[PDB]
Amino acid sequence: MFKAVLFDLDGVITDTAEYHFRAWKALAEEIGINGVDRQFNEQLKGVSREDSLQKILDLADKKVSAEEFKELAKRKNDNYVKMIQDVSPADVYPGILQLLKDLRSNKIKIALASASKNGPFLLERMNLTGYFDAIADPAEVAASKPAPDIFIAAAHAVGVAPSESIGLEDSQAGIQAIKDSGALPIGVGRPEDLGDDIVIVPDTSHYTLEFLKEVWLQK
């Protein structure tokens, strides 16, 4: 049986994309740029801060100095950190708390494999910290998803090989990173987005220990 589960944060445990979106929107409004809506935000998801800011500036064809660019970037991050102060256990995705309990009761290791720079803070606010055996530090890994490094680090941090692990992800890059790490992916979302070759569930309420066991046995 698998010995660990490696969790992405956004789109698996909770929604942080909402707060990034709101923070970019509020920045854009604050400097008179229109058009930062949820559709446009698709071009900002999982993209660096610089790239995002550049794309938002490119809407209005607005020019800034290096000093101004830096300050804008900081203001968005400050706004994001303010907005996540509201995170609570009410923000945990369905099925996830029960899954963590059940994994823990079965001595299966639980690790976070997220690019979130606020991962520990977020898990604390959601009261999940006690379930986690490690949180992979994205500052200590060389390359981001779809590189496998973050999943490798998460596995190793709990004393397992990625080949002994299931990885849970909602993104194409993340599924690819899981695959390349050696772990078994189980996607959440749509096969139209994540591929027909992996097991995918429609939402997180389908991530149960029994289902994960069945998937493991069938691989």
CB of 87 to Mg ion, least distance (A): 16
- Whether residue 204 contacts residue 96, with contact meaning beta carbons closer than 8 Å, is answered with yes
Query: Helix, strand, or coil here: 13?
Result: coil
Is 8 marked active-site? yes
CB of 6 to Mg ion, least distance (A): 12
Distance CA 93, CA 11 (A): 8
Listed in sequence order, the residues at least 6 apart from 210 whose beta carbon sits closer than 8 Å to its beta carbon are: none
Bridge partner list, 135: 112
Site for Mg ion in 148-177 (CB under 5 A): 170-171
Nearer to Mg ion, 69 or 121 (CB): 121
Nearer to Mg ion, 11 or 138 (CB): 11
Q: Of 196, 197, 218, 216, whose CA–CA distance to 208 is shortest?
A: 216
Site for Mg ion in 45-104 (CB under 5 A): none
**Binding Mg ion by CB under 5 A: which of 2, 5, 11, 113?**
11
Per the annotation, does 8 bind a ligand?
yes
Nearer to Mg ion, 18 or 75 (CB): 18
Per the annotation, does 159 bind a ligand?
no
8 binds Mg ion, rule: CB under 5 A: yes
Distance CA 102, CA 151 (A): 21
19 binds Mg ion, rule: CB under 5 A: no
Distance CA 38, CA 44 (A): 10
Report, as residue numbers or ranges, the catalytic residues: 8, 10
Please give the residue ranges that form the binding site for Mg ion (CB under 5 A).
Answer: 8, 10-11, 170-171
